[PDB]
Amino acid sequence: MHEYDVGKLKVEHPWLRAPADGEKNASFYAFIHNNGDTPDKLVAVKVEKFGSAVIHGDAKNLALEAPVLLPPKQKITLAPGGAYVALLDAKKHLEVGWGLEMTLVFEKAGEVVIDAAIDAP
Amino acid sequence: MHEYDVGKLKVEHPWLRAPADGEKNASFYAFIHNNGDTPDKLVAVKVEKFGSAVIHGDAKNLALEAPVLLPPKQKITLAPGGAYVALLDAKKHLEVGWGLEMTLVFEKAGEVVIDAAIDA
Ligand SMILES: [Cu+2]
Numbered sequence: 001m002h003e004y005d006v007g008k009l010k011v012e013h014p015w016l017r018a019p020a021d022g023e024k025n026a027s028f029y030a031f032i033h034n035n036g037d038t039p040d041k042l043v044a045v046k047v048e049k050f051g052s053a054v055i056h057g058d059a060k061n062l063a064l065e066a067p068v069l070l071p072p073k074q075k076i077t078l079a080p081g082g083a084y085v086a087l088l089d090a091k092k093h094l095e096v097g098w099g100l101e102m103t104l105v106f107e108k109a110g111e112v113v114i115d116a117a118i119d120a121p
Numbered sequence: 122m123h124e125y126d127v128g129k130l131k132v133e134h135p136w137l138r139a140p141a142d143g144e145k146n147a148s149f150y151a152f153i154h155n156n157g158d159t160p161d162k163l164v165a166v167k168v169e170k171f172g173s174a175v176i177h178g179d180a181k182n183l184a185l186e187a188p189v190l191l192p193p194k195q196k197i198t199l200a201p202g203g204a205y206v207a208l209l210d211a212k213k214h215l216e217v218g219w220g221l222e223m224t225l226v227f228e229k230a231g232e233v234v235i236d237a238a239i240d241a
């Protein structure tokens with residue numbers, strides 16, 4: 001539904017803000033809960049409808065490409081103004097009612113396919 | 122993840138960014154889906170651990186105090202940088218892992234008690 005389980009991780013309410021007018025980039029957001037006793041990392045994102053996905057997981061330096069670190073028994077927020085995944089080069093114009101299929105790749109927990117909900121206004 | 126149904130509305134993953142202590146104000150966020158054919162509005166928020174809550178529901182002017190309008194068959198995101206609820210005058214330091222109990226007040230659908238997760 002709006003939450004996806006992989007290993008002892010939970011990806012909750014994945015969503016993205018659609019490209020603004022004249023822009024071709026989108027931003028992907030989610031809440032990732034690590035309910036396990038070992039750390040993990042979001043290391044890659046695969047998406048067919050965009051050219052590529054770049055993880056910006058260091059909130060203190062968002063210009064840098066960096067994985068999202070997922071300490072044990074902690075949750076991490078990807079949200080506007082903080083850590084997020086940049087979705088570059090949309091193949092088509094995004095409409096809200098559409099969802100966006102993505103694959104999140106975690107170093108330890110492996111891959112999980114999600115359907116991200118779209119914010120366009 | 123916490124999800125709440127009231128009428129044809131769904132409130133998903135309510136959360137807040139804890140006060141940048143020493144400051145005593147927090148910001149409340151949520152995803153609100155109106156899956157019905159009638160409009161509603163988020164008009165008030167009640168929270169016992171804060172002095173008051175002020176809704177800034179107009180994305181075009183975030184300074185304005187205004188309800189969150191919830192048109193039919195649409196969803197609204199309250200998120201950092203956009204529409205949100207300001208939680209003013211924390212009475213005490215928040216305990217992060219426990220969440221924050223709040224009451225959302227909708228014009229038509231009425232009240233809903235939620236447990237908001239805390240981003241620290
Ligand atoms: Cu969460």
Ligand SMILES: [Cu+2]
Pocket residue numbers: 002013117133152153154196
């Ligand atoms: Cu939602």
